[PDB]
Every structure is written in structure tokens, then in C-alpha cells.
């Protein structure tokens, strides 16, 4: 195999070394949302190859501790106070950066920030600030597969509107649209397990009919690298679905099987009932702080996004265009994390 | 040539070189006894193009290289034995480097070609190896010569060669081109 | 080429910064391959960076014809490459791939073209064939005319004669000192 | 050139008493356990020439020198500058091993070591140094010889003038 | 301008028009002064300090320079020629940078 350059202008001058931690890569990156699940792996991929990553974070030293190990001396720059509404800080963050990745998103609404702020206002404002600079060459935005303007869920609708705004201001931006991402710190399998084990009943929207294409975090992280190593990818949206399309019922059953749960704890909370149970609780969320007890699963938006098929459109760009073979998320290393919990020879 | 005549032990290597070999006959021991001193009695500058050799001939650092002044110590340098392309003599030299930088160039013994002497141009032209350097492929556009990758430059050369045919293609080799 | 001069449409400069201005027809496509930016690079549509004598292991022949070789004292700078590798890569791009793909194979090709290149470090004697050559070129030497020029050196200033020397600051100071 | 007449005596004697068993070229390199791509590197077997600054003959191949003077050196590879502190960074594992520790008394010893490990090598013999003064200044007496300006012409003598 | 100027020496411990021994540090960054390479501020440089100190008159044609007042707490002992030296063109201690000049050679 032959190392492929990061297709950035004047990279040939600055780049030097084998491509490792101590080598010099000509990529300075401002990854918004670095401390998140998706952002941390992107930071790891970029910094692993000797590049410098600027990580704006909302003040939290313990949350951004893993990012410190990611790179060599002076390569991972952690900016302490990030606000989505502060223009001057955003300009300072992307001052030296030639690529900007936006992974900032909220699964649920709160009193301080709504979907329309984070998923619409921040992309537009950041798009204008990046456009005025000109030094930034590549822009990557991470969105859900099911995001559509004509979507019942407010999260997936606002995300698509923000993506359209980004496309308007920067025409050469690439919209990465992965599916439900499986990982050790993921919110897919971990939430499903917590539902199966520490919840009285596991409500399943409809009968698990909704189809999904889960993908492993390393595959999306590698896909980001392949986007940055090709300039021909610019201006295109890539639907990074997984190798296998599975219904939600199959994933629940297979989690029950791998964990060797005694029996099936899942119940049928059909739609038109969740739309009445969670509808007031959304208004409850918008007027109260972040609470661990209820979140993500316990929302009308989640029920609305679990009544549709979040699958890649037939004619679409994907992993094949990036020359990546996605790994199965129901077998192999991907499933080791749930495997450690219980496999029936365990405890 | 930098001078520290206080460090001068009164050997006559510089005078003998300037007379017998260089043949400019500029340096001599003026004085008698302890206050005897070496150098031009008048203010004169050494004119030979073999002037650098007195620095190597000087055993006690009284004559030193002004370009290579206070820049490095001997133990810090890695020496590689190569040849000088300054002229067709092919003087045998030893290039001393610290890291990625050439720090100094000194001759080597080859009685066949350069006994142990080096011309000033070859000795002190390493300075111009750090300046006006080409680092990246450049392809011309309306905005001028601009950064390009190796593939793009080769593509432009391919489109250019396609037009030309036979003796329309012409090659001019330079002074420093090698056999390969 | 000598019999029927053809206006060049593409000119390849292999480190040639001293070309006569009439050499390039001023509408030609110029490819400059070299390591300093000088008169050659300024007049280039494509510039291909190459290594210098300090950065490459290359063969040079003396005025006595002794074949001597350089070593890589310092690593190559930026996105520059060894010159023979550049030409072979361009040969693959243009559709005429060259047989050699390694430095020893290039040296073997040099040995085939001229056997003495295999004898690195040794000067090979020449058979005295000069008289037969001049007997061969009888008509041409008669064709040659007389010029109103006197036998003299072409080196105006010794310190600057090539691109490396012209870039050197030290050589410029030496030249200014001589010209004052 | 006479004899060191020290521990080197027993050193040489241990050399001549003992010997090594012959093996096929490159077989030991597999026993070494190092990455096999190490032996893809090319080897130059040379003796350093004398530094022009100093007039000592110890480092040269001279009868005075009693130390190993033939080095195995590997070709130079890429080097860069640390972005933070400008330090010289490298990825070459064999950067300084050959210069620092691979010292041999004779060219055949280094060639045997290289062939035993499987390294391809090119041996470069030092340019011969012959301590022969030129005929003009062959001796101290030649400095004040009649060669400088010829035999003194005696046409200036008063007898010859008159 | 500094990009195409020849490195030169002011001449306090050197001559007015000599070459300056220079390494290639700062050549990429674009710095061509000694102090710029290592000091990034706008404060007073040590060269500015040493220039402010004035030459000192001494008697004789040689002065012993120990750098500091106590011989064992400063530079090695140095003997500097005071011949052909004046206030405008003083002799310099290479270790310390102190400047000296004497009128004795003029038979005074």
C-alpha cells in the first residue's frame, strides 16, 4: 500500500515524515464537538497522522482529558470557552485552520438551547465565518441519514435545514451522513442495553419494523480521512450506511441473544400512544435542565424517527465511492463491548 | 578570513603557503622577538582564490573562516566525503552537516587531483544552498507559476509533448547536471 | 538537428540557467528541472524540483575523465526528487517507459554507453585517435571561417559562475570587495 | 608499526587462536531477529579521511594507528524539524549505529560481517597518502639552494667590470 | 530588503564592513537579525544593554580583563592590546563586551 496525500493546497511543501505521530502533516483542523462520541474519533484520526487539531470545547477539563493523549506536543490545541453564539471565538478558532469539521449536535432539547439554535443557527453563522476567511479549504458536516426537510421529528428536520444553509454559503462542503454509529461510547447499543436491563419495561416503537443501517465508528472515522484525502469528494453528500440493513426488532433480539437475557423484556408501545405519552414531556424538557432520568428514548421525536426507515437512498454516494468496506456491527470486534457484559459463560 | 593574532604561534605555514603555493606573497612576519607579528604590514585583503586554505593550514585558530564563525563545534558535525562540482577539477571534499543543514565544506586528500587544496568558491558556496531553493512542482497559469503536485506537472508536460514532434523537442543540459 | 535546424516547440532545461537567449524561441513550452530559481526557472511553464549535489548520489567526470561520485550529505528538501527518477517518472507518464527502475540499473546503462563509467575513481587512458578525426573532418574544418575575437577566458567573475554561487551571499561580498 | 605490547597482544592472540564456523550468507540475519527490511538497506564500507584542520595521523590508516578505522555506514534518510521546537526529527533506526559502533580493523572483516548479515556493500578504498616532498623543497638545504635564482653571476665583480 | 542584504557586522567587536557568520536559523521564518531569532518581544535586548555602557580609560598598552571584579567569579583572564585605541574606537573584551581605550601609545 502507498500512502495517499491529504489533498490540500501546498501540502507537498509542509508535509514531511512517515505519516505518524511525530511526522508533519499539513492539516490544521478545527473540529467542533471534539469531546463528543463522533468528534473524538475524528480528532484521533487527524492527529494520529501528525496533523494539528484545534478542539473548541465548553469548559469541562475532565471531558476533554482523552483528547490530550491524542497527539504529540503542541498538536492538540484545546480552547477552553466555546459558545455557539460567539462570533469572535469562532474566528479565533479557525484562524490557522485549513479544514473545519462540525460535529456539534443535540439529541434532545433543553431550556438554554433548542434544536433550531444548534442545528440551524450555528451551521449558518459558522458557514459565514468560514466563507469570509478563505484559508479554509475543506468543510465537512456530520448529519443523520434520516434527516429530511419533510420529517416529523424536529431534530432530523432542523439538521437538514442547517445542512442546506451550509451548502448555500460554502458550495464545496461535504455532508457526511452516517447511520446509527456503534462504538464503545455510542448512544445506540449502550442505550438499548440500559433499556433492556435497568428499565422496568423496554418499550419498542411499533413492532421494531423500522429498518436501520448501523455502522462502526472506525469506519466513519476512516471515511472522514478518505474525504480529506480526495478533493473530488467536495460538494457531495455521502450516506455512510453499514454493510447490513437490519430491522430494529432484529437488533433487539440479537442484543438479547448476545447478552443472554433470560427472556424478551421488550414490549409493544405502538405509535399514536407514544405521541400522547411523550408529547407533554417535550414541553417538560424545554423548561427544565439536563436530567439523566429521562432523555433521547423518552421523546416524541424519537418515536417519530422510529416509525420511518432510516436507510440510504438507492442512488447515493457511500462507502464504496470512498473504497472502504464497512465492518459488520453484529459480529466481530464491533460487538465485543456488549459481549463483555454477558455471553452465558460469563456470570 | 577572520583574524585572532593573539592565538598565533609563530609557525610560518601561512607565509610559506602565500609565497610558495598561492603566490600572492602578501603575508610575512614583521617584527623581531616576542612582538613579531604575522600579516600584511599595510591594510591589505588576501586576493588569491586559494585564500581559504590558510585557515586549514593554521594549527591554532589564529586564521579562521568568517562565514563559518561561531556557528558550530567540530563534534556536532557529520562528515560525508563527496566531490566539488564547482569546476571540472572535481576536487575531493568533506561536507560537514548538522541535521538537515550543511555547515562547512573542507578538502580531502587526493594527490591525483586536488593535493589537499580547495578553491574559495567551492569552500564557501554552501551558503547559497539555503537560498532561492525550489521545493515544489510549479505549473504556470494566468496568475503565474503556482504550486502543483507531481502528477499535475507531469500531465501538463504530457499535453505539451503531445504537440511537439521530432526535433521540435529540445534539451539543454546545465553545468551541474549529472551523468544519470 | 545540425543539418536542418527546427524551431523548438518544447525545451527541457536540465539545470541550465546559463542558456543563450536565442536557444528558446520565446514561444516554446519550457520545462525547467533544477534546484535553484534563476534565469531558467523564471522562463519556465513547468518547474520540476530536483536535488542538489549535496542531496544526491551522482556521477561526474573530470577534465581528466576520472569518474567520481557524490554522496547524500543532507536529505532532499520539500517535494523534490532525484533527477533521474523525475525523468523516468515523466517517461512513464508520457507513454515511453524507460527500462531502468533503480540506481544500479542506471549505472549499468552508463557502463554500457561508456565502459569507463564502471571504473569509478580510476582515470582511463585514451587511444590517440585525434589525427584520424581531423583527417575525417577535412571538409568541415575548411568550412569553418575566421572570427574577429581574441583567445581569452569566458569567466568574467570567478566567484559567481553558476546558480549556487549566484545565490551565495558570501560570494557576493567577495565580488563587491574585488570591485571597489 | 612495531608492536603495541599491551592488552592488544592478548586481544590479537585470542583472535588467532579462535575462529568462527562458516554459514551461508544472510542466514545469521534471520537469527538476529531484527526487521528483515533492515538488510534491504545498502552498506558503504570506508575508512574516514584525515580532517584538514588537524595534522594528526591517528584517524587515518597509518602504521601509527592501532585502532579499528573501517566503518560500516548506512545511507542517509529523511530528516525534518519538530514543528513545536525545531528539533531534528528522524524515522531512521540505523542512523547512528554504524558510525558509532561498527568499527573494523580490516576491509575484509567488515565485508564478512555484511555478507554474514546479508547487507549489500560497496567497499571504498581510501585515497593513498604518500609522504613524498617535492623536488624543489625536498630538504631544508633546498630552501637556500642556487635553484632560487641560478648561480650568482660574477659579471658584477670589479675585475670583470674593468 | 533584509531578504537580499548581505549579513554585515556593525563593528563594535568586529570591523564595520565584514561578513557576519550566520547559520540558517530563522531563514524560513524570515528573521535575519540575531536577537529576532531568539527574542519575540519588544523589550530591550542585551546588545542594547552592552552598547549603553561606555568605554573606560586605562593606563598602559595592555589591560587585564577578568570580566567581573573578582577573578574567579567571571570570565577567564584576558590581555587586550590598547594600542591604536580611542574613545570612538575602543578595544573590546570578547567574553564580557566591555570597552577599553588608552592614550599611552600617543606618548601621554
Amino acid at each position: 500500500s502507498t500512502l495517499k496525500p491529504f489533498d490540500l493546497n501546498a501540502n507537498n511543501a509542509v508535509r514531511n515524515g512517515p505519516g505518524g505521530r511525530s511526522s508533519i502533516g499539513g492539516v490544521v483542523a478545527t473540529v467542533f464537538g471534539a469531546n463528543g462520541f463522533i468528534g473524538s474519533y475524528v480528532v484521533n484520526e487527524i492527529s494520529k497522522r501528525g496533523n494539528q487539531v484545534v478542539c473548541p470545547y465548553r469548559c469541562n477539563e475532565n471531558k476533554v482529558q482523552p483528547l490530550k493523549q491524542m497527539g504529540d506536543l503542541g498538536q492538540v490545541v484545546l480552547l477552553p470557552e466555546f459558545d455557539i453564539h460567539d462570533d469572535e471565538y469562532i474566528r479565533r478558532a479557525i484562524s490557522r485552520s485549513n479544514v473545519v469539521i462540525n460535529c456539534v449536535g443535540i439529541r434532545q432539547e433543553t431550556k438554554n438551547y433548542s434544536y433550531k439554535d444548534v442545528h440551524v443557527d450555528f451551521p449558518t453563522r459558522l458557514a459565514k465565518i468560514v466563507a469570509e476567511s478563505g484559508k479554509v479549504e475543506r468543510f465537512i458536516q456530520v448529519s443523520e441519514m434520516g434527516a429530511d426537510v419533510s420529517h416529523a421529528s424536529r431534530r432530523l428536520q432542523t439538521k437538514a435545514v442547517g445542512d442546506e444553509a451550509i451548502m448555500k454559503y460554502i458550495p464545496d462542503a461535504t455532508i457526511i451522513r452516517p447511520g446509527n454509529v456503534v462504538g464503545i461510547e455510542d448512544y445506540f447499543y449502550n442505550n438499548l442495553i440500559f433499556q433492556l436491563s435497568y428499565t422496568i419495561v423496554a418499550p419498542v416503537i411499533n413492532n421494531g419494523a423500522n429498518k436501520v443501517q448501523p455502522t462502526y465508528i472506525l469506519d466513519v472515522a476512516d471515511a472522514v480521512v478518505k474525504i480529506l484525502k480526495d478533493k473530488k469528494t467536495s460538494g457531495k453528500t455521502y450516506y455512510l450506511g453499514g454493510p447490513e440493513t437490519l430491522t430494529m426488532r432484529q437488533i433487539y433480539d440479537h442484543l438479547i441473544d448476545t447478552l443472554r437475557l433470560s427472556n424478551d423484556d421488550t414490549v409493544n408501545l405502538r405509535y399514536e400512544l407514544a405521541k400522547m405519552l411523550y408529547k407533554p414531556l417535550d414541553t417538560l424538557r424545554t423548561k427544565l435542565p439536563e436530567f439523566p432520568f429521562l432523555g433521547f428514548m423518552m421523546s416524541s421525536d424519537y418515536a417519530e424517527e422510529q416509525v420511518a426507515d432510516s436507510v440510504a437512498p438507492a442512488g447515493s454516494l457511500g462507502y464504496k465511492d470512498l473504497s472502504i468496506s464497512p465492518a459488520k456491527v453484529t459480529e466481530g470486534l464491533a460487538i465485543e463491548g456488549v459481549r463483555f457484559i454477558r455471553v452465558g459463560g460469563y456470570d | 578570513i577572520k583574524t585572532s593574532m593573539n592565538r598565533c604561534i609563530h609557525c610560518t605555514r601561512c607565509v610559506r603557503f602565500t609565497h610558495e603555493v598561492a603566490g600572492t606573497s602578501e603575508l610575512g612576519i614583521t617584527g623581531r622577538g616576542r612582538d613579531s607579528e604575522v600579516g600584511t604590514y599595510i591594510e591589505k585583503l588576501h586576493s588569491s582564490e586559494l585564500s581559504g586554505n590558510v585557515i586549514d593550514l593554521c594549527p591554532v585558530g589564529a586564521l579562521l573562516s568568517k562565514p563559518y564563525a561561531f556557528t558550530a563545534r567540530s563534534w556536532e558535525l557529520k562528515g560525508t566525503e563527496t566531490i566539488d562540482v564547482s569546476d571540472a577539477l572535481g576536487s575531493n571534499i568533506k561536507v560537514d552537516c548538522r541535521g538537515t543543514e550543511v555547515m562547512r565544506i573542507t578538502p580531502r586528500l587526493n594527490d591525483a587531483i586536488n593535493e589537499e587544496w580547495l578553491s574559495d568558491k567551492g569552500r564557501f558556496q554552501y551558503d547559497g544552498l539555503k537560498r532561492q531553493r525550489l521545493n515544489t512542482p510549479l505549473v504556470k497559469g494566468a496568475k503565474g507559476l503556482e504550486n502543483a503536485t507531481w502528477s499535475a506537472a507531469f500531465d501538463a508536460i504530457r499535453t505539451a509533448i503531445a504537440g511537439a514532434k521530432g526535433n521540435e523537442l529540445k534539451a539543454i543540459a546545465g553545468k551541474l547536471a549529472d551523468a544519470e | 538537428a545540425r543539418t536542418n535546424p527546427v524551431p523548438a516547440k518544447v525545451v527541457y532545461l536540465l539545470g541550465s540557467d546559463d542558456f543563450k537567449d536565442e536557444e528558446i524561441p520565446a514561444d516554446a513550452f519550457v520545462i525547467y528541472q533544477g534546484h535553484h530559481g534563476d534565469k531558467g526557472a523564471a522562463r519556465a511553464n513547468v518547474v520540476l524540483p530536483g536535488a542538489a549535489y549535496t542531496e544526491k548520489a551522482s556521477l561526474f567526470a573530470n577534465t581528466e575523465g576520472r569518474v567520481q561520485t557524490t554522496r547524500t550529505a543532507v536529505p532532499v528538501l520539500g517535494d523534490a526528487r532525484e533527477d533521474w527518477k523525475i525523468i523516468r517518472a515523466l517517461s512513464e507518464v508520457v507513454g515511453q517507459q524507460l527500462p531502468y527502475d533503480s540506481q544500479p540499473q542506471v549505472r549499468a546503462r552508463l557502463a554500457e554507453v561508456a565502459p569507463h563509467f564502471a571504473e569509478i575513481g580510476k582515470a582511463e587512458s585514451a587511444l590517440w585517435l585525434n589525427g584520424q578525426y581531423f583527417k575525417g573532418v577535412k571538409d568541415l574544418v575548411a568550412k569553418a571561417a575566421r572570427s574577429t575575437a581574441s583567445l581569452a577566458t569566458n569567466i568574467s567573475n570567478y566567484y559567481m559562475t553558476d546558480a549556487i554561487s549566484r545565490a551565495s551571499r558570501t560570494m557576493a561580498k567577495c565580488t563587491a570587495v574585488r570591485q571597489q | 608499526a612495531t608492536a603495541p605490547q599491551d592488552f592488544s597482544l592478548a586481544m590479537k592472540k585470542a583472535d588467532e587462536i579462535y575462529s568462527g564456523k562458516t554459514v551461508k550468507a544472510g542466514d545469521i540475519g534471520f537469527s538476529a531477529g531484527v526487521p528483515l527490511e533492515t538488510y534491504n538497506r545498502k552498506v558503504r564500507i570506508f575508512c574516514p579521511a584525515k580532517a584538514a584542520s588537524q595534522s594528526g595521523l591517528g584517524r587515518t590508516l597509518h602504521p601509527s594507528s592501532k585502532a579499528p578505522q573501517w566503518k560500516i555506514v548506512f545511507e542517509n534518510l529523511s530528516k525534518w524539524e519538530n514543528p513545536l521546537m525545531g528539533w531534528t526529527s528522524t524515522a531512521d533506526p540505523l542512523e547512528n549505529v554504524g558510525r558509532s559502533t561498527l568499527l573494523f580493523y580490516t576491509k575484509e572483516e567488515a565485508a564478512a560481517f555484511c555478507a554474514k548479515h546479508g547487507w549489500e556493500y560497496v567497499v571504498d578504498e581510501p585515497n593513498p597518502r604518500k609522504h613524498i616532498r617535492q623536488k624543489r623543497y625536498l630538504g631544508y638545504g633546498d630552501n637556500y639552494s642556487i635553484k632560487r635564482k641560478g648561480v650568482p653571476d660574477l659579471a658584477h665583480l670589479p675585475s670583470n667590470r674593468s | 530588503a533584509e531578504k537580499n542584504k548581505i549579513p554585515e557586522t556593525v563593528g563594535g567587536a568586529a570591523f564595520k564592513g565584514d561578513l557576519r557568520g550566520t547559520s540558517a536559523v530563522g531563514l524560513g521564518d524570515g528573521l535575519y537579525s540575531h536577537t529576532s531569532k531568539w527574542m519575540q518581544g519588544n523589550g530591550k535586548s542585551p546588545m542594547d544593554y552592552i552598547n549603553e555602557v561606555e568605554p573606560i580609560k586605562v593606563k598602559g598598552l595592555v589591560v587585564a580583563s577578568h570580566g567581573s571584579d573578582d577573578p574567579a567569579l567571571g570570565c577567564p583572564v584576558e590581555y587586550i592590546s590598547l594600542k591604536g585605541t580611542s574613545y570612538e574606537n575602543p578595544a573590546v573584551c570578547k567574553y564580557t563586551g566591555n570597552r577599553y581605550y588608552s592614550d599611552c601609545w600617543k606618548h601621554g
Partner: peptide
């Protein structure tokens, strides 16, 4: 957050410790 190396992102004039000057192509 007072002292950082001169090659740091925080440094006002960040330093690339390159020891070679690069030719600048002529305009147009």
C-alpha cells in the same frame, strides 16, 4: 497560560523552523 514554545498555536507569530529560504515565483 503564559509561557508556550514559539512553535505553539498560541504564539502570535508562530514559527516554522525551516532553515532554507524558498524561491518566490515572479508575478504574472
Amino acid at each position: 497560560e503564559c509561557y508556550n514554545p514559539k512553535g505553539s498555536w498560541f504564539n502570535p507569530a508562530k514559527r516554522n523552523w525551516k532553515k532554507v529560504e524558498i524561491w518566490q515565483p515572479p508575478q504574472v
